[PDB]
């Protein structure tokens, strides 16, 4: 059921409480659920269920803190989902806070009074000395409520770095990077790191290991907050997003390219975030061209993911009060939609487009049924398009554009033909 | 070696003696499976090529395959059969086409269903190219109508439209609210198709909250959607919303898990794979339960829903914790699912990977929850705890241990056996 | 002298026995990897020593020992890197040893859930095995033929799992996936594969395009005896991703 408590050396990020911090937490949290599912070592999850990540960080002043509240808070020198022991498990600030020093169900205090006597009685008055000193290093994490932890100091005869990180409060590279990030955040006043970590994050898939990549990138991503492969790409998207929330059309073009060049899992993640990113950085008059254009483009592997984005953008317009664009961009684009070559696919794109544009409840809700039947053209696929077009033709469109609608349908009727039996 | 060599030599003789036929009819009527099996040997290939050049011989060959099709159904033998029905005589086109629709197409081996669809299409094209006399004589009215009725009463006409349209080419010689949307979502979600479960979950989420319980608890609702419904509803709960979908799915999951436990025998005995059915009045009831395909596939489907609930219950609102009245019925269901999977190994083969996973998911999570642990660790569940140990040990060896190997290398008797099993 | 490499590898075997005692034999929760840092340092020195002696086949053996230790100690993403180092050091002088080391890298990537890395390594294996082991001097020689069968089945399952878009879909992938269809050729298309396995892989590549979920369930139990455990895991991932996709979060 359990793994060891952690108490990270880093404190909560202040920037996350702001307007541009809350909306960042929603979008970067979607990317976090997916980086966890793709590369977590899953050491505290036995079951396959993808989205069950947790960290063993108890609240103190108790119950475990949720993973979605621990964004960038876990120690950078720990690989994602690793729950095993390391030299920094519990921070110096947590032993000062939880035990009031400020310079469970078991009698662990008596176990800690013991051994502080017995080990001192062997190492104060070399194999046993080395293993007993190791034992003191480990067991010091359960020392509470004492001057007698200074018995460690008086008992005198990676290197120093798991130690310098206490005094300032692949295994060599991890702790050396963690030292560098902690200095830059807490002791800024007493730029080469930020350069050479970018060099490490731009080597080959083999010259920079995956656990070195993800830790250094999350290190730089923490330095940007506080105002002080599919998985390698998903991590790089997090660094892009935290920059965007702390040239805009270039920063969106790279996401549409991420959908077109990405594996279906990677593309499905980017298609979940893209609606809110657009709303946070662009007015909907400028959005509407790109999102229709990338649903229609021949360099689009994933119409069924794009069909959920152009539903968010239309439903946003249809609820913010700018209800003109959810007719005007439909009438502008329906020539391009009707003239795309593969007929079942073109008809299915229009069934999505009109479902997404609709007035009512229910016809906004039917979209997963339409997305289910991608590429089909049975009786139910033509009949749905007739009904969904009859919703648009009644409740949206004036006779001059209603004649424009008739004219573009006639230009392809020569499944489109049976609309002329119900539009009249 | 003699059995096959003797047939091959006899095919060589009959191929050199085609001026008479009594030996050709014997070889087909008695050795059709061996002729097909050896069809790659040159004399048998030449003999197949001779049967292709006489109408009565090709007729006898089709009748012989019709008479052994239940043993020719294995993939290699079915391919070799189709390789021996390509090139068959033109006068037998209605006979071989009748064989292709009646006995084939229905096979789960999708490549062989495509091979036979193409061969069935190539034969209707030969009947369309021939004269009306001597084509209509090979398949008349009523016979063609029984072919097309079979293709439409099965799913085959929708799955093989080139064949169905070629048979037609030969034969000629307005928008309600809730009460429509509920009917439309019923058409998708009240049938056993697993092709669109995430889209099915999204659709049932937009049924209004008061109707969900009736829509889910009905006998036609797809149980495969319960795990999707719980997983989708948890996204609403983790956003700080109430989820009518999570609540309905929780009550339907627990109601079904409880309801199938009432079908079990009232008195429980340890499941022991080595020699069952000494208390025959218990084991005959388990055979009647676990051998029924409608009960058996309900268990790992409900276990998928149960495991999806048990993995989240630690981070839910206290309102949604396991009812203390259900804690015995969950342990009984978990045991009965591990027993059912073990029974399927004994009498059939490996269970479906997802179904093995679903049973083991429930077992894993039920031993992690301290309330369910307290039930199975109690004295009155000793035979249930012993069933878990016996079933898990049996599943582990049936997957991991070859015949002639052991799991390790360089107080009724069942309690002592359960001790030795957990220790190794 | 060269006996320094013997001293360093015998020292590394002592440190790896200490790490195996702590992590595998005792399963101590108090372990933090100090013996493994020492093992990686002594084998690193002996690897560089063998390379300045011009013995890259001896350096590769020490890379394999560390990779095997990392895999056995629960670090498969790290082990895959040293298995690929071993393959690179062997390849110009021992092509079949390099294919053994790449096979262990691909197994380690599958343990690490690095499916696109595994797909690339198996593709490199299938290329090298045709280049070094499939000539008249055409059909493959027996040792290479077993590698070719492994790669083909695994790549087909990985391509059915990952489903790459255009331009990620290499000529090598398109060409493999073309074979797993049928149209016009009956009156031997199985290639290196057993014919029973080939017809079930054909059927699986077709059932996944059609999303024919009940056919994939049927094929998964029929293929279970024919596949390796690693390949049965891949086929489970294909059926799992078909019934409940990743990247949706819900």
């Amino acid at each position: 059921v359990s793994c060891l408590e952690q108490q990270p050396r880093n404190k909560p990020l202040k920037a996350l409480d702001t307007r541009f911090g809350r909306k960042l937490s929603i979008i970067r949290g979607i990317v976090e659920q997916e980086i966890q599912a793709m590369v977590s070592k899953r050491e505290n999850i036995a079951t396959h269920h993808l989205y069950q990540a947790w960290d063993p960080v108890p609240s103190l002043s108790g119950a475990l803190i949720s993973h979605e509240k621990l964004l960038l808070q876990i120690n950078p020198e720990r690989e994602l989902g690793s729950m095993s022991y390391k030299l920094g498990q519990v921070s110096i600030h947590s032993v000062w806070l939880g035990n009031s020093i400020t310079p469970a169900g078991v009698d662990i205090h008596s176990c800690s009074q013991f051994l502080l006597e017995l080990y001192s009685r062997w190492i104060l008055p070399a194999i046993l000395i080395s293993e007993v000193v190791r034992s003191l290093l480990v067991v010091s994490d359960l020392f509470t409520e004492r001057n007698q932890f200074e018995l460690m100091y008086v008992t005198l005869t990676v290197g120093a770095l798991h130690g310098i990180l206490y005094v300032l409060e692949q295994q060599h590279v991890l702790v050396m990077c963690a030292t560098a990030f902690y200095l830059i955040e807490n002791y800024p006043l007493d730029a080469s790191i930020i350069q050479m970590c970018g060099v490490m994050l731009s080597g080959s898939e083999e010259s920079t290991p995956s656990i070195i990549y993800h830790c250094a990138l999350r290190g730089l991503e923490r330095l940007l907050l506080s105002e002080q492969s599919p998985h390698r790409a998903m991590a790089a998207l997090g660094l892009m997003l935290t920059c965007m929330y702390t040239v805009a059309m270039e920063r969106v073009s790279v996401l549409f390219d991420r959908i077109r060049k990405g594996f279906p899992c990677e593309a499905r993640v980017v298609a979940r975030i893209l609606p809110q990113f657009l709303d946070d950085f662009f007015p909907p008059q400028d959005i509407m061209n790109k999102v229709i254009g990338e649903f229609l483009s021949n360099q689009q592997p994933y119409p069924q993911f794009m069909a959920t984005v152009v539903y968010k953008v239309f439903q946003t317009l249809h609820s913010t009060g700018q209800s003109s664009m959810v007719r005007d961009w439909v009438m502008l684009s329906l020539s391009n939609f009707t003239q795309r070559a593969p007929v079942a696919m073109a008809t299915w794109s229009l069934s999505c487009f009109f479902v997404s544009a609709s007035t009512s409840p229910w016809v906004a809700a039917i979209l997963p049924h339409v997305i289910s039947r991608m590429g089909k053209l049975e009786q139910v696929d033509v009949n749905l398009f007739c009904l969904v077009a009859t919703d648009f033709y009644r409740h949206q469109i004036e006779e001059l554009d209603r004649r424009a609608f008739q004219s573009v349908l006639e230009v392809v009727a020569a499944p489109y033909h049976r609309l002329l039996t119900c539009l009249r | 070696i003699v059995r096959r060599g003797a047939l091959i030599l006899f095919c060589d003789y009959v191929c050199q003696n085609l001026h008479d036929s009594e030996h050709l009819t014997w070889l087909i009527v008695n050795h059709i499976q061996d002729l097909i099996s050896l069809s790659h040997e040159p004399p048998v290939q030449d003999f197949i090529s001779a049967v292709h050049r006489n109408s009565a011989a090709s007729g006898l060959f089709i009748q012989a395959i019709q008479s052994r099709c239940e043993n020719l159904s294995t993939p290699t033998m079915l391919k070799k059969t189709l390789q021996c029905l390509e090139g068959i005589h033109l006068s037998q086109s209605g006979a071989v086409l009748t064989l292709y629709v009646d006995r084939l197409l229905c096979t789960p081996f999708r490549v062989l269903a495509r091979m036979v669809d193409i061969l069935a299409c190539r034969r209707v094209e030969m009947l369309l190219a021939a004269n009306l006399q001597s084509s209509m004589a090979q398949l008349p009215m009523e016979e063609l109508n029984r072919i097309q009725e079979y293709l439409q009463s099965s799913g085959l006409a929708q799955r093989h439209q080139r064949l169905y349209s070629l048979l037609d080419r030969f034969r000629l010689s307005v928008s309600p609210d809730k009460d429509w949307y509920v009917h439309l979502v019923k058409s998708q979600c009240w049938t056993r198709s697993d092709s669109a479960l995430l889209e099915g979950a999204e659709l049932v989420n937009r049924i209004p909250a008061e109707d969900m319980n009736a829509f889910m608890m009905n006998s036609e609702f797809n149980l495969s959607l319960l795990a999707p419904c719980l997983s989708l509803g948890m996204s609403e709960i983790s956003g700080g919303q109430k989820s009518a979908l999570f609540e309905a799915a929780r009550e339907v999951t627990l109601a079904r898990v409880s309801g199938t436990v009432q079908q079990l025998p009232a008195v429980h005995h340890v499941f022991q794979p080595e020699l069952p059915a000494e208390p025959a009045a218990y084991w005959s009831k388990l055979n009647d339960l676990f051998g029924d395909a409608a009960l058996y596939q309900s268990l790992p489907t409900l276990a998928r829903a149960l495991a999806q609930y048990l993995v989240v219950v630690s981070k839910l609102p206290s309102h949604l914790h396991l009812p203390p009245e259900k804690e015995k019925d969950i342990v009984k269901f978990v045991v009965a699912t591990l027993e059912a999977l073990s029974w399927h190994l004994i009498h059939e083969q490996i269970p479906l990977s997802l179904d093995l996973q679903a049973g083991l998911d429930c077992c894993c999570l039920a031993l992690q929850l301290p309330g369910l642990w307290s039930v199975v660790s109690s004295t009155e569940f000793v035979t249930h705890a012993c069933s878990l140990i016996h079933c898990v040990h049996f599943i582990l060896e049936a997957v991991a241990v070859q015949p002639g190997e052991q799991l390790l290398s360089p107080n009724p008797k069942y309690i002592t056996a359960a001790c030795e099993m957990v220790a190794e | 002298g060269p006996g320094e490499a013997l001293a360093l590898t015998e020292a590394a075997r002592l440190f790896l026995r200490q790490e195996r005692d702590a992590r595998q034999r005792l399963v101590c929760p108090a372990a933090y990897g100090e013996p493994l840092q020492a093992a990686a340092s002594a084998l690193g020195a002996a690897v560089r020593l063998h390379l300045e002696l011009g013995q890259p086949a001896a350096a590769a053996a020490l890379c394999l020992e560390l990779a095997a230790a990392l895999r056995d100690l629960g670090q498969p993403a790290a082990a895959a890197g040293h298995f690929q180092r071993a393959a690179q050091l062997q390849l110009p002088q021992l092509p079949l040893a390099a294919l053994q080391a790449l096979g262990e890298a691909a197994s380690c990537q599958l343990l690490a859930r690095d499916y696109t890395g595994a797909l690339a390594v198996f593709t490199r294996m299938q290329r090298l095995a045709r280049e070094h082991g499939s000539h008249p001097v055409p059909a493959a020689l027996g040792a290479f033929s077993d590698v070719l069968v492994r790669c083909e089945v695994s790549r087909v399952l990985l391509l059915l799992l990952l489903q790459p878009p255009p331009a990620k879909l290499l000529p090598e992938h398109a060409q493999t996936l073309e074979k797993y269809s049928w149209e016009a050729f009956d009156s031997e298309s199985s290639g290196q594969l057993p014919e029973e396995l080939f017809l079930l892989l054909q059927s699986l590549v077709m059932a996944t395009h059609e999303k024919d979920t009940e056919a994939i369930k049927s094929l998964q139990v029929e293929m279970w005896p024919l596949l390796t455990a690693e390949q049965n895991h891949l086929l489970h991932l294909v059926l799992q991703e078909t019934i409940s996709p990743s990247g949706q979060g819900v």
Binding site: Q299, P303, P342, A344, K376 | Q158, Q161 | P166, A174
Partner: peptide
């Protein structure tokens, strides 16, 4: 009546359906 779609080979498209 299924075919492969021109813009993505893993998408099926329909002619006789």
């Amino acid at each position: 009546x299924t075919r492969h779609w021109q813009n993505n080979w893993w998408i099926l498209y329909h002619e006789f359906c």
